[PDB]
CSV table of C-alpha atoms in Angstrom, one decimal:
chain,number,residue,atom,x,y,z
A,153,UNK,CA,0.0,0.0,0.0
A,154,UNK,CA,3.0,2.4,0.1
A,155,UNK,CA,3.5,1.9,-3.7
A,156,UNK,CA,-0.2,2.2,-4.4
A,157,UNK,CA,-0.1,5.3,-6.6
A,158,UNK,CA,2.6,7.6,-7.8
A,159,UNK,CA,5.4,7.8,-5.3
A,160,UNK,CA,7.9,10.7,-5.5
A,161,UNK,CA,11.5,9.6,-5.8
A,162,UNK,CA,14.7,11.6,-4.7
A,163,UNK,CA,18.2,10.5,-5.6
A,164,UNK,CA,21.6,11.6,-4.3
A,165,UNK,CA,25.0,10.3,-5.5
A,166,UNK,CA,28.5,11.2,-4.5
A,167,UNK,CA,31.2,9.5,-6.5
A,168,UNK,CA,34.8,9.3,-7.3
A,169,UNK,CA,36.2,7.7,-10.5
A,170,UNK,CA,40.1,7.7,-10.8
A,171,UNK,CA,40.4,10.7,-8.4
A,172,UNK,CA,37.7,12.8,-10.1
A,173,UNK,CA,34.8,13.7,-7.8
A,174,UNK,CA,31.2,14.4,-8.7
A,175,UNK,CA,27.7,14.8,-7.4
A,176,UNK,CA,24.4,14.0,-9.1
A,177,UNK,CA,20.9,14.8,-7.9
A,178,UNK,CA,17.7,13.4,-9.4
A,179,UNK,CA,14.0,13.7,-9.0
A,180,UNK,CA,11.1,11.7,-10.2
A,181,UNK,CA,8.0,9.5,-9.7
A,182,UNK,CA,7.5,5.8,-9.7
A,183,UNK,CA,4.4,3.8,-10.3
A,184,UNK,CA,4.8,0.2,-9.2
A,185,UNK,CA,1.4,-0.5,-10.8
A,186,UNK,CA,2.8,0.0,-14.3
A,187,UNK,CA,6.3,-0.6,-13.2
A,188,UNK,CA,7.2,2.8,-14.7
A,189,UNK,CA,9.9,5.2,-13.6
A,190,UNK,CA,10.5,8.7,-14.8
A,191,UNK,CA,13.6,10.3,-13.4
A,192,UNK,CA,15.7,13.4,-14.2
A,193,UNK,CA,19.3,13.9,-13.2
A,194,UNK,CA,21.7,16.8,-13.0
A,195,UNK,CA,25.4,16.8,-12.3
A,196,UNK,CA,25.7,19.4,-9.6
A,197,UNK,CA,29.4,19.7,-9.8
A,198,UNK,CA,29.6,20.8,-13.4
A,199,UNK,CA,30.3,18.2,-16.1
A,200,UNK,CA,30.1,14.5,-15.5
A,201,UNK,CA,33.5,12.8,-15.8
A,202,UNK,CA,32.0,9.5,-17.1
A,203,UNK,CA,29.3,8.9,-19.7
A,204,UNK,CA,25.8,9.2,-18.3
A,205,UNK,CA,24.7,5.7,-19.4
A,206,UNK,CA,27.2,4.1,-16.9
A,207,UNK,CA,25.3,5.4,-14.0
A,208,UNK,CA,21.8,4.2,-15.0
A,209,UNK,CA,21.9,1.0,-12.9
A,210,UNK,CA,23.2,2.8,-9.9
A,211,UNK,CA,20.9,5.8,-10.0
A,212,UNK,CA,15.1,1.7,-7.1
A,213,UNK,CA,13.9,-1.8,-8.1
A,214,UNK,CA,11.1,-1.4,-5.6
A,215,UNK,CA,9.0,0.1,-8.4
A,216,UNK,CA,8.9,-3.1,-10.4
A,217,UNK,CA,5.5,-4.5,-11.3
A,218,UNK,CA,5.1,-7.8,-9.8
A,219,UNK,CA,2.2,-9.8,-11.3
A,220,UNK,CA,-0.4,-11.0,-8.8
A,221,UNK,CA,0.8,-14.6,-8.7
A,222,UNK,CA,4.3,-13.3,-7.9
A,223,UNK,CA,3.6,-11.1,-5.0
A,224,UNK,CA,5.3,-13.2,-2.3
A,225,UNK,CA,8.6,-12.9,-4.2
A,226,UNK,CA,8.8,-9.1,-3.8
A,227,UNK,CA,11.8,-8.4,-1.4
A,228,UNK,CA,12.1,-4.8,-2.4
A,229,UNK,CA,8.6,-3.7,-1.3
A,230,UNK,CA,8.3,-6.0,1.6
A,231,UNK,CA,11.3,-4.2,3.1
A,232,UNK,CA,9.6,-0.9,3.2
A,233,UNK,CA,9.7,1.6,4.7
A,234,UNK,CA,12.9,0.9,6.8
A,235,UNK,CA,14.3,0.2,3.4
A,236,UNK,CA,17.3,-1.8,2.3
A,237,UNK,CA,21.0,-1.4,1.5
A,238,UNK,CA,22.0,-2.1,-2.1
A,239,UNK,CA,25.6,-2.8,-3.0
A,240,UNK,CA,27.1,-3.7,-6.3
A,241,UNK,CA,30.5,-4.3,-7.9
A,242,UNK,CA,30.2,-3.5,-11.5
A,243,UNK,CA,33.0,-4.7,-13.8
A,244,UNK,CA,33.5,-2.9,-17.1
A,245,UNK,CA,35.2,-5.3,-19.4
A,246,UNK,CA,38.9,-4.7,-20.2
A,247,UNK,CA,38.5,-1.6,-18.0
A,248,UNK,CA,37.8,-0.7,-14.4
A,249,UNK,CA,35.1,-1.0,-11.9
A,250,UNK,CA,32.6,0.9,-9.9
A,251,UNK,CA,31.9,-0.2,-6.3
A,252,UNK,CA,28.6,1.2,-5.0
A,253,UNK,CA,26.6,1.3,-1.8
A,254,UNK,CA,23.2,2.8,-1.3
A,255,UNK,CA,20.4,3.1,1.1
A,256,UNK,CA,17.0,3.1,-0.5
A,257,UNK,CA,14.1,3.9,1.8
A,258,UNK,CA,11.2,6.2,2.6
A,259,UNK,CA,11.9,9.6,4.2
A,260,UNK,CA,8.5,10.9,4.9
A,261,UNK,CA,6.3,10.2,1.8
A,262,UNK,CA,9.3,10.2,-0.6
A,263,UNK,CA,11.3,7.2,-1.7
A,264,UNK,CA,15.0,8.3,-1.4
A,265,UNK,CA,18.0,6.6,-3.0
A,266,UNK,CA,21.4,7.8,-1.4
A,267,UNK,CA,24.4,6.4,-3.1
A,268,UNK,CA,28.2,6.5,-2.9
A,269,UNK,CA,30.3,5.3,-5.7
A,270,UNK,CA,33.9,4.7,-6.1
A,271,UNK,CA,35.5,3.7,-9.5
A,272,UNK,CA,39.2,2.7,-9.8
A,273,UNK,CA,41.4,1.3,-12.6
A,274,UNK,CA,39.8,3.1,-15.5
A,275,UNK,CA,41.8,3.3,-18.7
A,276,UNK,CA,42.2,6.8,-19.9
A,277,UNK,CA,41.8,6.0,-23.6
A,278,UNK,CA,39.0,3.6,-22.9
A,279,UNK,CA,35.3,3.8,-23.7
A,280,UNK,CA,34.4,4.9,-20.3
A,281,UNK,CA,36.8,7.8,-19.6
A,282,UNK,CA,37.2,8.3,-23.3
A,283,UNK,CA,33.4,8.9,-23.6
A,284,UNK,CA,32.9,6.6,-26.5
A,285,UNK,CA,29.5,5.3,-25.4
A,286,UNK,CA,26.4,6.2,-27.4
A,287,UNK,CA,23.7,8.0,-25.3
A,288,UNK,CA,21.1,5.3,-25.4
A,289,UNK,CA,20.3,2.0,-23.7
A,290,UNK,CA,19.4,-1.6,-24.2
A,291,UNK,CA,17.1,-4.2,-22.6
A,292,UNK,CA,18.3,-6.7,-20.0
A,293,UNK,CA,17.0,-9.2,-17.4
A,294,UNK,CA,18.1,-8.8,-13.8
A,295,UNK,CA,18.4,-12.3,-12.3
A,296,UNK,CA,17.4,-12.3,-8.7
A,297,UNK,CA,17.8,-14.9,-6.0
A,298,UNK,CA,17.5,-15.0,-2.2
A,299,UNK,CA,20.4,-14.9,0.3
A,300,UNK,CA,18.6,-16.5,3.2
A,301,UNK,CA,21.7,-16.2,5.5
A,302,UNK,CA,21.7,-12.4,5.0
A,303,UNK,CA,18.0,-12.3,4.9
A,304,UNK,CA,18.1,-10.6,1.5
A,305,UNK,CA,18.8,-11.2,-2.1
A,306,UNK,CA,21.7,-11.4,-4.6
A,307,UNK,CA,21.2,-10.5,-8.2
A,308,UNK,CA,23.3,-10.4,-11.2
A,309,UNK,CA,23.3,-9.3,-14.8
A,310,UNK,CA,25.4,-8.1,-17.8
A,311,UNK,CA,24.6,-4.7,-19.3
A,312,UNK,CA,25.7,-4.0,-22.9
A,313,UNK,CA,26.6,-0.5,-23.8
A,314,UNK,CA,26.7,0.6,-27.4
A,315,UNK,CA,30.0,2.2,-28.3
A,316,UNK,CA,30.1,4.7,-31.1
A,317,UNK,CA,32.2,2.6,-33.5
A,318,UNK,CA,29.5,-0.1,-33.5
A,319,UNK,CA,30.9,-2.5,-30.9
A,320,UNK,CA,29.5,-3.2,-27.4
A,321,UNK,CA,31.0,-2.7,-23.9
A,322,UNK,CA,30.0,-5.3,-21.3
A,323,UNK,CA,29.5,-4.2,-17.7
A,324,UNK,CA,29.1,-7.2,-15.3
A,325,UNK,CA,26.9,-6.4,-12.3
A,326,UNK,CA,27.0,-8.3,-9.0
A,327,UNK,CA,24.4,-7.1,-6.5
A,328,UNK,CA,23.5,-7.5,-2.9
A,329,UNK,CA,20.5,-6.1,-0.9
A,330,UNK,CA,20.0,-6.4,2.8
A,331,UNK,CA,17.1,-4.9,5.0
A,332,UNK,CA,17.7,-1.9,7.1
A,333,UNK,CA,14.9,-3.0,9.5
A,334,UNK,CA,15.0,-6.0,11.8
A,335,UNK,CA,11.8,-7.9,11.0
A,336,UNK,CA,10.9,-10.7,8.6
A,337,UNK,CA,11.1,-9.8,4.9
A,338,UNK,CA,9.9,-11.6,1.8
A,339,UNK,CA,12.7,-14.0,0.4
A,340,UNK,CA,11.9,-14.9,-3.3
A,341,UNK,CA,12.3,-17.9,-5.4
A,342,UNK,CA,14.6,-17.5,-8.3
A,343,UNK,CA,13.2,-15.0,-10.9
A,344,UNK,CA,14.1,-12.0,-12.9
A,345,UNK,CA,13.1,-8.4,-13.7
A,346,UNK,CA,12.8,-7.6,-17.4
A,347,UNK,CA,14.1,-4.0,-17.5
A,348,UNK,CA,13.9,-1.5,-20.4
A,349,UNK,CA,15.3,2.0,-20.4
A,350,UNK,CA,15.2,5.1,-22.6
A,351,UNK,CA,17.5,8.1,-22.3
A,352,UNK,CA,16.9,11.7,-23.4
A,353,UNK,CA,17.3,15.3,-22.8
A,354,UNK,CA,15.2,18.2,-21.7
A,355,UNK,CA,16.0,20.8,-24.4
A,356,UNK,CA,15.4,23.7,-22.1
A,357,UNK,CA,18.0,22.3,-19.8
A,358,UNK,CA,21.5,23.7,-19.6
A,359,UNK,CA,23.1,21.6,-16.9
A,360,UNK,CA,24.7,18.3,-17.6
A,361,UNK,CA,21.8,16.0,-17.2
A,362,UNK,CA,19.9,12.9,-18.2
A,363,UNK,CA,16.3,12.1,-18.3
A,364,UNK,CA,15.5,8.5,-17.7
A,365,UNK,CA,12.4,6.4,-18.4
A,366,UNK,CA,12.3,2.8,-17.3
A,367,UNK,CA,9.9,-0.1,-17.2
A,368,UNK,CA,10.4,-3.1,-15.1
A,369,UNK,CA,8.4,-6.2,-14.7
A,370,UNK,CA,9.1,-9.4,-12.8
A,371,UNK,CA,8.9,-12.6,-14.7
A,372,UNK,CA,10.2,-16.2,-14.3
A,373,UNK,CA,7.7,-17.8,-11.9
A,374,UNK,CA,4.7,-19.7,-13.4
B,203,UNK,CA,4.6,24.7,-37.2
B,204,UNK,CA,2.4,21.6,-37.6
B,205,UNK,CA,4.6,19.7,-35.2
B,206,UNK,CA,4.8,22.6,-32.8
B,207,UNK,CA,3.1,21.0,-29.8
B,208,UNK,CA,1.5,17.6,-29.1
B,209,UNK,CA,0.1,16.1,-32.3
B,210,UNK,CA,-2.4,13.3,-32.1
B,211,UNK,CA,-1.4,10.1,-34.0
B,212,UNK,CA,-3.7,7.4,-35.5
B,213,UNK,CA,-2.4,4.1,-36.9
B,214,UNK,CA,-4.1,1.4,-39.0
B,215,UNK,CA,-2.4,-1.8,-40.2
B,216,UNK,CA,-3.7,-4.7,-42.3
B,217,UNK,CA,-1.4,-7.6,-42.6
B,218,UNK,CA,-0.9,-11.1,-43.8
B,219,UNK,CA,2.0,-13.3,-42.6
B,220,UNK,CA,2.0,-16.9,-44.2
B,221,UNK,CA,-1.7,-16.8,-45.0
B,222,UNK,CA,-2.7,-15.5,-41.5
B,223,UNK,CA,-4.5,-12.2,-41.6
B,224,UNK,CA,-4.7,-9.5,-38.9
B,225,UNK,CA,-5.5,-5.9,-38.1
B,226,UNK,CA,-3.9,-3.6,-35.6
B,227,UNK,CA,-5.2,-0.1,-34.5
B,228,UNK,CA,-3.2,2.3,-32.5
B,229,UNK,CA,-3.5,5.8,-31.0
B,230,UNK,CA,-1.2,8.2,-29.5
B,231,UNK,CA,0.6,11.6,-29.4
B,232,UNK,CA,3.8,12.8,-30.7
B,233,UNK,CA,6.0,15.7,-29.7
B,234,UNK,CA,8.7,16.5,-32.2
B,235,UNK,CA,10.0,19.0,-29.7
B,236,UNK,CA,11.2,16.2,-27.4
B,237,UNK,CA,11.2,13.7,-30.1
B,238,UNK,CA,8.9,11.6,-27.9
B,239,UNK,CA,6.2,9.2,-29.0
B,240,UNK,CA,3.6,7.5,-26.9
B,241,UNK,CA,1.4,5.0,-28.8
B,242,UNK,CA,-0.9,2.1,-27.8
B,243,UNK,CA,-1.9,-0.7,-30.1
B,244,UNK,CA,-4.7,-3.4,-30.1
B,245,UNK,CA,-5.0,-6.4,-32.3
B,246,UNK,CA,-8.6,-6.0,-33.5
B,247,UNK,CA,-8.8,-9.4,-35.0
B,248,UNK,CA,-8.2,-11.3,-31.8
B,249,UNK,CA,-4.6,-12.5,-31.1
B,250,UNK,CA,-1.5,-11.4,-33.0
B,251,UNK,CA,0.0,-14.2,-35.1
B,252,UNK,CA,3.5,-12.8,-34.8
B,253,UNK,CA,5.3,-11.3,-31.7
B,254,UNK,CA,4.5,-7.7,-31.1
B,255,UNK,CA,8.1,-6.5,-31.2
B,256,UNK,CA,8.4,-7.4,-34.9
B,257,UNK,CA,5.8,-4.6,-35.8
B,258,UNK,CA,7.4,-1.8,-33.9
B,259,UNK,CA,9.4,-0.3,-36.9
B,260,UNK,CA,6.3,-0.6,-39.1
B,261,UNK,CA,3.7,0.8,-36.7
B,262,UNK,CA,6.2,8.0,-38.0
B,263,UNK,CA,9.7,9.3,-38.1
B,264,UNK,CA,8.3,12.8,-38.6
B,265,UNK,CA,8.3,13.1,-34.8
B,266,UNK,CA,12.1,13.0,-34.6
B,267,UNK,CA,13.8,15.9,-32.8
B,268,UNK,CA,16.0,17.7,-35.2
B,269,UNK,CA,18.6,19.9,-33.6
B,270,UNK,CA,18.5,23.5,-34.8
B,271,UNK,CA,21.6,23.2,-36.9
B,272,UNK,CA,20.0,20.2,-38.6
B,273,UNK,CA,16.7,21.6,-39.7
B,274,UNK,CA,17.3,21.6,-43.4
B,275,UNK,CA,17.8,17.9,-43.4
B,276,UNK,CA,14.3,17.1,-42.1
B,277,UNK,CA,12.6,15.4,-45.1
B,278,UNK,CA,9.8,14.0,-43.0
B,279,UNK,CA,8.3,17.2,-41.7
B,280,UNK,CA,9.1,19.2,-44.9
B,281,UNK,CA,6.7,16.8,-46.7
B,282,UNK,CA,3.8,17.7,-44.5
B,283,UNK,CA,0.8,17.7,-44.7
B,284,UNK,CA,0.4,15.9,-48.1
B,285,UNK,CA,2.6,13.4,-46.4
B,286,UNK,CA,4.8,10.7,-47.8
B,287,UNK,CA,4.8,7.0,-48.7
B,288,UNK,CA,7.1,4.8,-46.7
B,289,UNK,CA,8.1,1.3,-47.9
B,290,UNK,CA,10.4,-1.3,-46.4
B,291,UNK,CA,11.5,-4.8,-47.0
B,292,UNK,CA,12.5,-6.2,-43.7
B,293,UNK,CA,14.6,-9.4,-43.8
B,294,UNK,CA,14.5,-11.6,-40.7
B,295,UNK,CA,17.7,-13.6,-40.6
B,296,UNK,CA,17.4,-17.3,-41.5
B,297,UNK,CA,13.7,-16.6,-41.7
B,298,UNK,CA,11.2,-14.8,-43.8
B,299,UNK,CA,10.4,-11.2,-44.7
B,300,UNK,CA,7.8,-8.5,-44.3
B,301,UNK,CA,7.2,-6.1,-47.2
B,302,UNK,CA,5.3,-3.0,-46.1
B,303,UNK,CA,3.8,0.1,-47.6
B,304,UNK,CA,2.3,3.0,-45.8
B,305,UNK,CA,1.0,6.4,-46.2
B,306,UNK,CA,1.8,8.8,-43.4
B,307,UNK,CA,0.1,12.2,-43.6
B,308,UNK,CA,-2.3,14.6,-41.9
B,309,UNK,CA,-6.0,14.0,-42.0
B,310,UNK,CA,-7.4,17.0,-40.4
B,311,UNK,CA,-5.4,17.8,-37.3
B,312,UNK,CA,-4.3,14.2,-36.8
B,313,UNK,CA,-1.2,12.5,-38.1
B,314,UNK,CA,-2.3,9.2,-39.6
B,315,UNK,CA,-0.2,6.1,-40.5
B,316,UNK,CA,-2.0,3.6,-42.8
B,317,UNK,CA,-0.1,0.5,-43.5
B,318,UNK,CA,-0.3,-2.8,-45.3
B,319,UNK,CA,2.0,-5.6,-44.6
B,320,UNK,CA,2.7,-8.9,-46.2
B,321,UNK,CA,5.1,-11.5,-44.7
B,322,UNK,CA,6.1,-14.7,-46.6
B,323,UNK,CA,8.5,-17.6,-46.1
B,324,UNK,CA,8.4,-17.7,-42.3
B,325,UNK,CA,9.6,-20.9,-40.6
B,326,UNK,CA,7.0,-22.4,-38.5
B,327,UNK,CA,9.5,-23.4,-35.7
B,328,UNK,CA,11.4,-20.1,-36.0
B,329,UNK,CA,11.7,-17.3,-33.5
B,330,UNK,CA,9.1,-15.3,-35.3
B,331,UNK,CA,6.1,-17.7,-35.8
B,332,UNK,CA,7.4,-19.7,-32.8
B,333,UNK,CA,7.1,-16.6,-30.6
B,334,UNK,CA,10.5,-16.9,-29.1
B,335,UNK,CA,11.2,-13.1,-28.9
B,336,UNK,CA,11.4,-11.4,-25.5
B,337,UNK,CA,8.9,-8.6,-25.1
B,338,UNK,CA,11.3,-5.7,-25.0
B,339,UNK,CA,13.5,-3.6,-27.3
B,340,UNK,CA,17.0,-2.3,-28.0
B,341,UNK,CA,18.6,0.9,-29.3
B,342,UNK,CA,19.5,1.5,-32.9
B,343,UNK,CA,20.6,4.1,-35.4
B,344,UNK,CA,18.5,4.6,-38.6
B,345,UNK,CA,20.9,5.7,-41.3
B,346,UNK,CA,19.2,8.1,-43.7
B,347,UNK,CA,20.3,9.4,-47.1
B,348,UNK,CA,18.6,11.3,-49.9
B,349,UNK,CA,17.3,9.7,-53.1
B,350,UNK,CA,17.4,12.8,-55.3
B,351,UNK,CA,16.0,11.0,-58.3
B,352,UNK,CA,12.9,10.0,-56.5
B,353,UNK,CA,12.9,13.3,-54.5
B,354,UNK,CA,13.0,11.4,-51.2
B,355,UNK,CA,15.2,9.4,-49.0
B,356,UNK,CA,16.4,5.9,-48.5
B,357,UNK,CA,17.3,4.6,-45.1
B,358,UNK,CA,18.6,1.4,-43.7
B,359,UNK,CA,19.3,-0.3,-40.3
B,360,UNK,CA,19.6,-3.6,-38.5
B,361,UNK,CA,17.3,-4.3,-35.6
B,362,UNK,CA,18.4,-6.9,-32.9
B,363,UNK,CA,15.6,-8.7,-31.2
B,364,UNK,CA,16.3,-10.6,-28.0
B,365,UNK,CA,15.3,-14.2,-28.2
B,366,UNK,CA,14.3,-16.0,-25.0
B,367,UNK,CA,17.3,-18.4,-24.9
B,368,UNK,CA,19.7,-15.4,-24.8
B,369,UNK,CA,20.6,-15.1,-28.5
B,370,UNK,CA,19.6,-12.3,-30.9
B,371,UNK,CA,17.5,-12.3,-34.2
B,372,UNK,CA,18.6,-9.7,-36.8
B,373,UNK,CA,16.0,-8.0,-38.9
B,374,UNK,CA,17.5,-6.1,-41.8
B,375,UNK,CA,15.5,-3.0,-42.8
B,376,UNK,CA,15.6,-1.4,-46.2
B,377,UNK,CA,13.5,1.8,-46.4
B,378,UNK,CA,12.2,4.2,-49.0
B,379,UNK,CA,10.1,7.4,-48.6
B,380,UNK,CA,8.6,9.5,-51.4
B,381,UNK,CA,6.4,12.6,-51.1
B,382,UNK,CA,2.6,12.4,-51.8
B,383,UNK,CA,2.6,16.0,-52.8
B,384,UNK,CA,4.2,17.6,-55.9
B,385,UNK,CA,6.3,20.4,-54.6
B,386,UNK,CA,9.9,20.8,-53.5
B,387,UNK,CA,10.8,18.8,-50.3
B,388,UNK,CA,13.9,19.0,-48.1
B,389,UNK,CA,16.6,16.4,-49.3
B,390,UNK,CA,19.1,15.7,-46.5
B,391,UNK,CA,22.8,15.1,-46.2
B,392,UNK,CA,23.7,11.8,-44.8
B,393,UNK,CA,22.8,11.4,-41.1
B,394,UNK,CA,21.0,9.2,-38.7
B,395,UNK,CA,18.2,9.0,-36.1
B,396,UNK,CA,19.2,7.6,-32.8
B,397,UNK,CA,16.1,5.7,-31.8
B,398,UNK,CA,15.2,4.1,-28.4
B,399,UNK,CA,12.0,2.2,-27.5
B,400,UNK,CA,10.4,0.7,-24.5
B,401,UNK,CA,7.4,-1.8,-24.6
B,402,UNK,CA,4.9,-2.5,-21.9
B,403,UNK,CA,1.3,-3.3,-21.1
B,404,UNK,CA,-1.7,-1.5,-19.7
B,405,UNK,CA,-2.7,-3.9,-16.9
B,406,UNK,CA,-6.4,-3.0,-17.2
B,407,UNK,CA,-6.2,-4.1,-20.8
B,408,UNK,CA,-7.7,-7.4,-21.9
B,409,UNK,CA,-7.1,-7.2,-25.7
B,410,UNK,CA,-3.8,-8.3,-27.3
B,411,UNK,CA,-1.9,-5.0,-27.2
B,412,UNK,CA,1.3,-3.2,-26.8
B,413,UNK,CA,2.1,0.2,-25.4
B,414,UNK,CA,5.0,1.8,-27.0
B,415,UNK,CA,7.3,4.7,-26.0
B,416,UNK,CA,10.0,5.9,-28.3
B,417,UNK,CA,12.5,8.7,-28.4
B,418,UNK,CA,14.2,9.8,-31.6
B,419,UNK,CA,16.8,12.3,-32.2
B,420,UNK,CA,18.7,13.2,-35.4
B,421,UNK,CA,22.5,13.1,-35.2
B,422,UNK,CA,25.4,12.9,-37.6
B,423,UNK,CA,25.8,16.4,-38.9
B,424,UNK,CA,28.2,18.9,-37.2
């Protein structure tokens, strides 16, 4: 019942990639009923040192639409409102890696996502620091599975980023979510979230920014 | 000035794939200012004989956002309102092909897209008739170039459809657009439309349907 209508979302990221520091703020709405997300981000420190698309997975899986027969497998929502801690190690192929940690939870009537990111070992002439990624996005499945010992879930997936020259840059994600609260939570059977994203720009917008539209739906359980 | 605000869109498709006939109706809005499209489709003849994703390219490139320095390369809009005729031969790899022909133009204050599609040579146990495609979509670039002789453009691109088992099904598109009117039109320099799409469902919707969200932006000219 928290995700019954449109829930406002607020995002805050502080990162550091090869010594370069940056901040990103975002605002939006989520509608777990359609599993739709509309967010907008702004680099508040000037210009983003890495391509915007590399931050999409980092910058709220609680807005996924879970079919009715799949409701007992919804860890994300069942953890609200104390929220949960999401962590990932993202490995960019033949390049470096981002290590992230975030707390997603309700602060009042707003779903907030506070993140801290650290990226090391990035090649200067690579697709990432070299900004060779096209500004668009592909479709993926986020495999999810419970971590009973930690009372949470583990998830994993491979994102494919389109480089300008036509090739693709794989970014391997390894995820871990644990509750912030102390009570029972819903531990799921193995399943996945079919995720789709679309990036664009607000033409009346001067700051470095990205507008993001995503759709997520759980699938995998019959 | 026709595409100045939100323009209503109306789509009508009559097809035939390996002897199976079907109709699709769609309704939406376009906003060439953001290069955003929101459409909804319904199979009016019952259940769609092919996967919904294979009809996305067929089911209005006039809503692309063309940056200000790229305005003289916009064939699509410059042909309004008499409109233009779009034709394609789409080759699905190791499978059959769709041959399409449509007239896109204004009827009153509504942009209408009337299409007729014929698909032949489809393998029964293939990804297409076998419905092995995931219900999602990827990002592509539509290369565009003028056809001065025909006073229109030719375009071409390769769509990658995600099959369920993890592989991909290529669909080669070959396109041709010619004006319906008789006056000068804008013939572009070589360039492309960065296109992004996201598919989903209206949960309160019983008919076979697809909700489509796309973003298109021209790029390629400096």
